[PDB]
Write a protein that binds this ligand. Structure first.
Ligand SMILES: [Cu+2]
Length: 224
């Protein structure tokens, strides 16, 4: 359980973004069903919010998360897993992020040399998660998606045992990307409902074994 409070642009807080520029779900509940339409942008994913974070291609964005209250424990430390960030063109206001539209722009999984997960790091940095908007990115409106996945019950899959399974916590953010050049259009066209499967070693993952590493689902980070 966790959701986003706000976005920071080059370390400057843009202010409470819930129902402003963040497509904030009603609560912190996990998505577990891979066929759910909510997988991409959570339960209110298709409802426009009125504002776009203003950022430049190349900027460092920070997404700030919380649990119940801004600046709390952020997420239960039981919930180890990766954090992935994605981008999609903002096709129209009532997009819900379903279909083949997404390109992965950042990922952290398991760092074996420290034996910490992306979520461990999220907690130690008090819910601040940093990534870069690619500088080659063609200016325009986009949806940014950041997703926490908790694997404390991923030793079962949801299809076999509905009371268990990987828990997905996606957050979709409206961004208006100011240009500086950049010609590059995200073109992985990844589709969470088709592309995430129960057979995925990164989804069917047992964290109660002597594993040395973790295969993060979906394609490698996009380049061009
Ligand atoms: Cu939870």
């Amino acid at each position: 359980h966790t959701r986003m409070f706000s976005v920071w642009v080059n370390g400057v807080d843009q202010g409470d973004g819930q129902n402003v520029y963040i497509r904030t779900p009603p609560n912190t509940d996990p998505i577990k069903d891979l066929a759910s339409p909510a997988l991409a942008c959570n339960v209110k994913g298709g409802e426009p919010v009125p504002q776009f974070v203003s950022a430049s291609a190349g900027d460092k964005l920070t997404f700030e998360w919380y649990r119940v209250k801004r600046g709390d424990d952020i997420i239960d430390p039981s919930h180890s897993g990766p954090i992935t960030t994605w981008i999609a063109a903002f096709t129209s206001p009532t997009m819900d992020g379903t279909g083949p539209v997404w390109s992965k722009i950042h990922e952290e999984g398991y760092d074996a040399s420290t034996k910490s997960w992306a979520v461990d790091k999220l907690i130690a940095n008090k819910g601040m998660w940093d990534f870069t908007l690619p500088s080659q990115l063609k200016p325009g409106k986009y949806m940014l998606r950041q997703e926490i996945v908790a694997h404390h019950e991923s030793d079962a899959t949801f299809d076999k045992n509905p009371k268990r399974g990987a828990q997905f916590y996606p957050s979709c953010v409206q961004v208006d990307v100011k240009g500086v050049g950049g010609d590059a259009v995200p073109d992985q066209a990844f589709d969470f409902n088709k592309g995430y499967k129960y057979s995925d070693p990164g989804i069917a993952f047992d964290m109660y074994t002597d594993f040395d590493s973790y295969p993060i689902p979906g394609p490698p980070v996009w380049d061009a």
